[PDB]
Design a protein around this ligand. Structure first.
Ligand SMILES: Cc1cc2nc3c(=O)[nH]c(=O)nc-3n(C[C@H](O)[C@H](O)[C@H](O)COP(=O)(O)OP(=O)(O)OC[C@H]3O[C@@H](n4cnc5c(N)ncnc54)[C@H](O)[C@@H]3O)c2cc1C
Ligand SMILES: Cc1cc2nc3c(=O)[nH]c(=O)nc-3n(C[C@H](O)[C@H](O)[C@H](O)COP(=O)(O)OP(=O)(O)OC[C@H]3O[C@@H](n4cnc5c(N)ncnc54)[C@H](O)[C@@H]3O)c2cc1C
Ligand code: SF4
Ligand code: SF4
Ligand code: SF4
Ligand code: SF4
Ligand code: SF4
Ligand code: SF4
Ligand code: SF4
Ligand code: SF4
Ligand code: SF4
Ligand code: SF4
Ligand code: SF4
Ligand code: SF4
Ligand code: SF4
Ligand code: FES
Lengths: 662, 189, 296, 137, 420, 95
């Protein structure tokens, strides 16, 4: 073997901590080293040219670069090694910057030089034993899955379908739309939410390239970037679509959404779409604008009285004995768009959320103010049904809170939606006054500051003080809000008819279960984690899975849609190519060393190992597609019958031996 | 605020109201942090503490203002404020602070520093005298001895009122910190 | 019969001895045995003494704790301020090593060491716990119904707050003390801002009597508006404030309430049949006679 | 005349990231530990540790992801069991078992990586030169 | 995705403002380190026709075919490919630097916001993607020393002229970015008139280790190290007086926190004062970043700066405002004052968006098709927006918007037909 | 602050310091807006006015506080303040 050692200065970031000349001379005197040389910026085009010229001139077998971290510049120098007539995987780095210079800057120079010599020696020892690998290319199934039917899921599904990829849209609830379907108006433009979204819901429902699967969950996921074998649970909806009815043999059809079933059902239960304010029968739709207008049956609350089937009549859409059906679907990529729920604000006892009647939260206020809600769009007091004339908005309710009860982060949109609600009350109830108890108004987006200016102009009162506690008047049920006006410098006691809490948001229910099924990690905040927080906010570390929407962190509908289309583009990249290259770190069983004990089989989380027949002997078989290169099996096998392709035992032991060489 | 005139009423009237960086005492802040055992430098002035205080609606006492003075190092503004002794230590502010600060513990540390610089109300010194003499902040008297006897209890409780040998140990504890030697000196005036 | 050292601070023995007498009698009637603490002193009162010097506060509270440590018993208290001092210094010195060291080398001048081996309980906390006498046992021990009396509870501040430092749960609207008054047969009523400080804490009682009395008068107004016939309390500080301060309010202001203030142990004695003379209700500033006519 | 020879075997996805973050944040620590960088700590065979100790490592450190945060779902449970058993073997062959430890460093704990470096260096300095180097002869 | 792409950049290098950034909030990563990989990908991609130092003269056509005419400005130096095409076998520019080593003209460097010299033949920084050494023909004196230094490589053609090229494209993506609002108009903060008042991109270049200083923040007036630094947040923003901008610039609270951290960690004992009026840390990990900065000990004074006076002798800056929470006026004397100035659409952006037919917002940024459900596309079909050109945003939001725009531009190309 | 005691010194000492919605005078605010011919209800309390005032560093005069009183309608707090006549009308705040 013939190895070249190229030591970067990183423009004095390394030459200001060690003696590069001494490191280079030591590399020259090292065994197996053909050429040792240095340059100011080895990651720059003259640096790659230097590598390539050295390879051609000295007939180099391998290249060692004493530079920054591999996690930063493996692709660069692997491509530089390829261009030059070598394999990309005859290359090895020695991290002498982020682990030598930047940590041994001060007052210790010959010690850092000795550390650099040791790292270069270990790198040369490994590279003298590296040999050729070729990355595995795997086919990509031409379908995609989008979990979540909110705005982010619908946008991602429409984007993929219009790019031409067949797409599955999984929604746990009987309708698509998400939270934006519950919103009444939208900041900062005051458009009606359903009016702007219904066009897109219709597009999703009609698109031939979208397989809209509502009221369905994801039981299990196995596979990788190539093929994800996703098992879906089709929950017993209880009612048949026209297509399914015709398939089952009923010519007359399935559900046409007439409503006779819910007209005759005698069970009455709260509506989760209306946050519980409104009744709905056992057979029901959330609202009149649901996209699949198919009238789910709630089997936890149905009493099987059979009146619904008599009302449905010849359509015969209702099957009261339906059971959870399971389907297995193979997909190439997956997009996660699970959204969010409101943090439980009844834990903050000083604001009497559950204990005082006239304290509500912002999604209940949005349903109360919507014209399609339980009221006729008239905001009335829950305690007595009278119209409020003073409304308080507690901003930051459970947010930027380090006490362990609330969330330590900002929920991003709660300042903006509180401004919207203040405007809505001041314009819908004549003479009503809105009080916002705020602590940093955050109107940062496009036209947001102008919206804030307009709300103040219309006459909302802004009191800069976090609410301390809330007391309920025993007779009028009015709410006494106690805080300090920090700018005025005095305590205040504002008595309002209705108190609205701008509660924090948290990941939806079951989101952690789903992201563990797909292999995604979590952030410090508890939201799903992205591949690189700056330059890759959509992709995750597990290949073939992408994030979209509030599930990655709270955001407004504009930012959510931008993120969703970004995720759709990233998921389309490998589908359009049809190939994708896996990293050749796989385990390879050496059969004439395997003894067939089968003990390694249970050490693989991905089930890549199995016992099979080769030449009569029972040996172990690696599904090289399923292997991920962790190395657990190869670190276990006592006989050394498992070889890890770029981190083989001879290579690692050569590194150890070179460290102890003196 | 132009400069010092040395006419005391005009100096009082035209006192410089403008905060300078020469007004900050980082040593004062560090002493407060150590004694209070709380993260007081992390206040972001939300006003929840003042909104919960029961002393604020009837006085000029502002616990948030005291927190700001602690953060900025305004020694001789915090310590000499007569509304440093209006805190009842009800702990509502500590109960509700979103940053897990104990403003009442900051108040307690400030009161200790005020005592060390000799600003202290006289009831505190009188209580020190009583505890030094008998070990009890609220000691027994003849009428209560008679009442206890008529009840059936012993004329004195099982405390240092009936075991006067522990009073000497209490006195040594107080003398170690010199509390009596400062309280009597301050009272003498 | 569980046994506890009975701390017995300053105000109960020296101003309201009926409180301590009823404490011993009623605790013995239920399965609790209250043992005298040998030479205990003022728990260095958290306001009037902690405001002066935290180190001597620590040293005196630790001395009080090591008396019961040598006794090898668990402290039982009847005062929220004494609970603050004793329990909180115990908790702080069970975890802070440099403070243990400092207190120990102060106490070594009197041949005395703190090791942190015992626990501190409030008597009402024991009455509420189920392992020790519970609400049902209190109901069993009650022999005079005390029915047809509206009774307002004052929790105080140093027992329950801050909730990040105690273990009694919600401080915004607790109902546990209301259950103990309901066990006696008296109906507990709810009044506006029931969790407000009485105003006597922190030495304000001494420093600014008018300020403290205004804070107390806000409470008295709310309680009268609710319609209480007595105010139960778990603190001799708060009882002293609500009792003396009614007289000082009558003289400094022109407000008359005449609302009897009783410790929960005194009400428990009344429920269990102790006599008003044996409770020394004549030692209160505010006459209890209307309340006695109602409940007797 | 004597400088400790400490060898670290750090996973790529949390411990290498943490060391890199410490370097980026400019957290100083003594230059006594040299690292190997395997993909997961599940890759670390027992024979790697024993080979290091018999070549003369005064100390050995193995650093990986927190439990539940392995990039490969469960590869550090295997490493943890292996290192518990290695601690037992070194104690029973009479070598000082505190020459070996396994730390769990996340990708964001550059400060904790610096503290681990300092503490490992201090402990090995207290322990002194390994006995194998003279027992061989 | 497989579509052949043209990347037009008016400047001799790709990268933009993020190439000027030193460290990035809230993760504190080195900006060049995280971006250099992606610059290399762009420079090597076979499907990308990277055309630096080139402008868009005219656009005609529609969703189907856009006949875009490009102006290839006279770079003055030949890439190896162009040199081989013209017949020079030895090559073109290899980025050795001998030309700029011998050039006698010295001019300010626009990449370093003018703080640093650069010759007439130059690169912005050592990490420029096309390392090809533009010649600045407005300042070259044609002395011919550069060609003698270049020698047999013969990369320098001092007589080169603006070449024009016409390119037919299916869709177009506009990503023109932003510039800093001219804050010298706000006279009460003596930006141009006091030496030690700078703005946030000049501070970012001064604090970067590759900047005019060795990464050492020093006072412009005398070159001494500051010990107190003030940050004027909202400088020219949320301002309805007609001089500043009426909107929030989105990232100025976050970058001021980053700069306060950087000074407090790079100069031992230095104190950062932030004169703020609504700290806006809304994004992911932003509130935690704010908490960490306060923990490290930045002073947060809630008051908009009223005016700034310069001490005549020490050149120190007296910042006058009110501490609104404290309730008193203040006079904080700092060694260095940093203005977190507002951002505005780049120079020439209105000309380019009129060439492409895009309208403007109330704020002056490019307008989107539907403000809620279509923040990338414009009303004119086949044109899409990406980045700060549509409104100020952080690098994460900018990248999400850019990929969204790429997806929208790919939708009609993959189909191959569009219906009008 | 419990209630009115009719002892003038104690009323002065225990004056209710707590702002109520009964304290707001919208008529006062509207009169101020009409007479001043300025958009005073649009103040967001930045403190620039007080930071520029030459009367503030030597007195208790706070123009921002007066703006807040105008916005909240605190008639009998603004009008009776003796620091209403310490404005020199230098117009720096307006500038
Ligand atoms: C009170 C309030 C007012 C607001 N007002 C505005 C406003 O005016 N303007 C604005 O721009 N933004 C507003 N927002 C923010 C806005 O709601 C969000 O930006 C937006 O809804 C994000 O949508 P999403 O698709 O990411 O999540 P969601 O809308 O929550 O959608 C997630 C979807 O996924 C489904 N799902 C969840 N888990 C699973 C699973 N395991 N399997 C399958 N499906 C699953 C859910 O049922 C849901 O349908 C407001 C938010 C609130 C709380
Ligand atoms: C001082 C400061 C600090 C910041 N710090 C951070 C930080 O720490 N973290 C963070 O996330 N964000 C930060 N930001 C914001 C960040 O810079 C932006 O989010 C980001 O640069 C947006 O990039 P862009 O591509 O949209 O625009 P730009 O980076 O401005 O790129 C636009 C490009 O287009 C070119 N161009 C312009 N007009 C034309 C034309 N007509 N023809 C051809 N080319 C043209 C320009 O030359 C430029 O190369 C900071 C901003 C500032 C001012
Ligand atoms: S390869 Fe790494 S060390 Fe070398 S110049 Fe590039 S970034 Fe710096
Ligand atoms: S009656 Fe039948 S067809 Fe009509 S809505 Fe009900 S299920 Fe659908
Ligand atoms: S079976 Fe009866 S209860 Fe169930 S949906 Fe039909 S009518 Fe309602
Ligand atoms: S968006 Fe506004 S209301 Fe919501 S948490 Fe952030 S600062 Fe508070
Ligand atoms: S590879 Fe090793 S562990 Fe696996 S079956 Fe063969 S001998 Fe057993
Ligand atoms: S390295 Fe071994 S254990 Fe790990 S995924 Fe591959 S086959 Fe499974
Ligand atoms: S409640 Fe806490 S954070 Fe808010 S002002 Fe008081 S001390 Fe500061
Ligand atoms: S502890 Fe003191 S400052 Fe805090 S609420 Fe009670 S009285 Fe006010
Ligand atoms: S001398 Fe020639 S080859 Fe070298 S940098 Fe200058 S133009 Fe390029
Ligand atoms: S011709 Fe002369 S002035 Fe122009 S770049 Fe060359 S050396 Fe510089
Ligand atoms: S981001 Fe912050 S500093 Fe910038 S304009 Fe908005 S509020 Fe002001
Ligand atoms: S009036 Fe004063 S406080 Fe209000 S916005 Fe104008 S300068 Fe700021
Ligand atoms: S006019 Fe002049 S004196 Fe009057 S408030 Fe404005 S700045 Fe102050
Ligand atoms: S990835 Fe680090 S321990 Fe497995």
């Amino acid at each position: 073997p013939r190895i070249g050692v190229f030591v970067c200065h990183c423009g004095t970031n390394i030459a200001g901590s060690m003696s590069i000349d001494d490191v280079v001379n030591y590399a020259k005197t090292l065994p197996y080293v053909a050429v040792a040389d240095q340059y100011q910026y080895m990651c720059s085009t003259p640096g790659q040219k230097k590598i390539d010229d050295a390879i051609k001139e000295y007939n180099l077998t391998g290249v060692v670069v004493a530079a920054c971290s591999p996690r930063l510049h493996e692709p660069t120098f692997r491509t530089a090694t390829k261009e030059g007539g070598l394999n990309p995987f005859r290359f090895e780095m020695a991290n002498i910057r982020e682990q030598n210079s930047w940590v041994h800057m001060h007052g210790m120079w010959d010690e850092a030089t000795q550390k650099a010599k040791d790292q270069v020696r270990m790198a040369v020892a490994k590279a003298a034993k590296l040999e050729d690998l070729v990355p595995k290319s795997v086919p990509v199934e031409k379908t995609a899955m989008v979990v979540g039917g909110g705005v982010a899921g619908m946008q991602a599904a429409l984007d993929l379908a219009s790019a031409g990829i067949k797409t599955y849209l999984i929604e746990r609830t009987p309708t698509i739309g998400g939270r934006m379907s519950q919103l009444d108006k939208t900041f900062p433009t005051l458009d009606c939410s359903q009016c702007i979204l219904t066009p897109k819901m219709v597009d999703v429902g009609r698109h031939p390239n979208i397989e809209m699967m509502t009221y369905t969950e994801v039981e299990k996921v196995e596979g990788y970037i190539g093929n994800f074998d996703v098992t879906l649970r089709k929950k017993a909806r209880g009612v048949l679509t026209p297509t399914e009815a015709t398939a089952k043999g009923i010519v007359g059809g399935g559900c046409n959404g007439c409503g006779d079933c819910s007209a005759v059902c005698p069970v009455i239960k709260p509506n989760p779409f209306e946050m519980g304010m409104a009744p709905r029968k056992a057979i029901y739709i959330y609202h009149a604008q649901v996209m699949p207008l198919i009238y789910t049956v709630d089997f936890d609350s149905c009493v099987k009285c059979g009146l619904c089937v008599e009302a449905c009549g010849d359509k015969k859409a209702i099957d009261l004995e339906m059971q959870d059906e399971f389907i297995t679907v193979k997909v190439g990529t997956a997009v996660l768009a699970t959204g969010y729920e409101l943090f439980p604000i009844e834990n903050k006892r000083e604001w009497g959320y559950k204990q005082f009647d006239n304290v509500i939260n912002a999604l209940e206020f949005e349903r109360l103010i919507c014209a399609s809600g339980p009221t006729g769009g008239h905001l009335v007091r829950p305690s007595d049904g009278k119209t409020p004339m003073k409304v308080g908005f507690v901003l930051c309710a459970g947010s930027r809170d380090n006490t362990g009860i609330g969330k330590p982060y900002c929920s991003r949109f709660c300042c903006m939606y509180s401004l919207k609600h203040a405007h809505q009350i001041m314009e819908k109830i004549p003479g009503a006054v809105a009080y916002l108890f705020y602590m940093d108004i955050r109107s940062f987006g496009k036209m947001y500051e102008e919206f804030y200016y307009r709300i103040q102009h219309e006459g909302a009162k802004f009191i800069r003080g976090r609410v301390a506690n809330v007391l309920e008047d025993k007779e009028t049920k009015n709410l006494h809000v106690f805080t300090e006006d920090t700018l005025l410098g005095r305590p205040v006691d504002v008595e309002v008819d209705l108190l609205v809490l701008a509660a924090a948001v948290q990941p939806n229910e079951g989101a952690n279960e789903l992201r563990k099924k797909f292999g995604v990690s979590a952030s410090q905040d508890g939201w799903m984690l992205e591949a690189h927080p700056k330059l890759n906010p959509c992709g995750t570390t597990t290949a073939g899975v992408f994030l979209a929407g509030v599930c990655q962190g709270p955001k407004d509908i504009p930012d959510t849609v931008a993120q969703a289309e970004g995720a759709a583009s990233a998921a389309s990249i490998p589908i359009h190519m049809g190939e994708v290259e896996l990293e050749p770190y796989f385990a390879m069983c050496i059969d004439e060393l395997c003894a067939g004990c089968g003990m390694c089989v249970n050490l693989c989380p991905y089930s890549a190992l199995s016992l099979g027949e080769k030449n009569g002997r029972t040996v172990m078989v690696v599904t090289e597609a399923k292997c991920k290169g962790c190395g657990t099996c190869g670190g276990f096998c006592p006989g050394g019958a498992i070889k890890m392709q770029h981190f083989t035992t001879p290579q690692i032991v050569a590194q150890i031996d070179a460290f102890f060489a003196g | 605020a132009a400069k010092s005139y040395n006419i005391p009423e005009l100096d009082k009237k035209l006192a410089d109201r403008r905060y300078h960086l020469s007004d900050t005492n980082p040593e004062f802040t560090q002493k407060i942090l150590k004694t209070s055992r709380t993260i007081a430098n992390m206040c972001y002035q939300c006003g929840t503490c003042t909104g919960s205080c029961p002393s604020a609606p009837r006085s000029s006492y502002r616990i948030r203002l005291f927190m700001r003075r602690c953060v900025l190092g305004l020694e001789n503004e915090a310590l000499t404020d007569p509304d440093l002794w209006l805190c009842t230590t009800c702990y509502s502010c500590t109960d509700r602070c979103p940053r897990d600060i104990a403003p009442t513990d900051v108040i307690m540390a400030m009161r200790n520093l005020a005592f060390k610089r000799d600003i202290v109300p006289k009831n505190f010194l009188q209580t020190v005298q009583l505890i030094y003499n008998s070990g009890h902040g609220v000691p027994n008297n003849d009428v209560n001895r008679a009442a206890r006897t008529k009840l059936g209890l012993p004329a004195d409780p099982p405390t240092t009122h009936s075991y006067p040998e522990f009073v000497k140990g209490i006195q040594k504890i107080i003398d170690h910190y010199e509390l009596k030697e400062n309280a009597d000196r301050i009272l003498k005036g | 019969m569980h046994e506890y050292a009975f701390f017995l601070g300053c105000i109960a023995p020296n101003r309201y001895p009926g409180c301590e007498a009823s404490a011993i009698k009623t605790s013995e009637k239920v399965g609790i045995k209250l043992l005298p603490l040998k030479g205990a002193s003022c728990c260095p009162a958290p306001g009037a003494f902690g405001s002066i010097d935290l180190n001597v506060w620590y040293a005196m509270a630790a001395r009080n704790l090591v008396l019961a440590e040598e006794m090898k018993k668990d402290i039982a208290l009847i005062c929220n301020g004494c609970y603050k001092s004793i329990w909180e210094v115990n908790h702080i010195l069970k975890h802070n090593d440099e403070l243990r060291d400092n207190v120990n080398e102060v106490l070594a001048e009197i041949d005395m060491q703190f090791k942190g081996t015992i626990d501190v309980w409030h008597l009402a906390e024991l009455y509420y716990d189920d392992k020790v006498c519970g609400v049902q046992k209190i109901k069993d021990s009650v022999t005079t119904p005390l029915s047809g009396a509206k009774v307002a509870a004052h929790y105080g501040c140093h027992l329950m707050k801050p909730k990040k430092e105690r273990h009694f749960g919600d401080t915004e609207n607790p109902m546990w003390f209301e259950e103990l008054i309901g066990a006696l047969g008296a109906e507990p009523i709810q009044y506006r801002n029931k969790m407000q400080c009485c105003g006597a804490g922190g030495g304000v009682r001494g420093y600014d009597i008018v300020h403290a009395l205004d804070i107390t008068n806000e409470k008295l107004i709310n309680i009268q508006e609710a319609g209480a016939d007595a105010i139960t309390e778990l603190c001799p500080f708060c009882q002293l404030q609500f009792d003396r301060g009614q007289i000082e309010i009558k003289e400094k202001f022109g407000d008359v309430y005449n609302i009897p203030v009783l410790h929960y142990n005194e009400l428990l004695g009344l429920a269990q049949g102790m006599s008003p003379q044996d409770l020394a209700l004549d030692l209160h500033a505010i006459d209890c006679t209307p309340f006695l006519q109602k409940v007797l | 005349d004597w400088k400790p020879q400490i060898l670290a075997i750090i996973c790529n996805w949390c411990s290498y990231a943490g060391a890199d973050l410490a370097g980026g944040a400019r957290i100083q620590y003594p230059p006594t530990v040299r690292a190997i960088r395997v993909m997961c700590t599940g890759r670390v065979d027992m024979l790697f540790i024993l080979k290091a100790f018999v070549e003369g490592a005064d100390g050995v450190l193995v650093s990986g992801c927190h439990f539940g945060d392995c990039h490969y779902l469960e590869g550090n449970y295997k490493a943890a069991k292996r290192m518990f058993m290695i601690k037992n073997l070194l104690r029973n062959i009479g070598l000082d078992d505190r020459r070996f430890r396994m730390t769990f460093v996340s990708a964001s704990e550059g400060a904790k990586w610096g503290m681990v470096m300092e503490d490992v260096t201090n402990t090995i300095k207290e322990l002194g030169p390994s006995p194998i180097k003279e027992f061989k002869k």
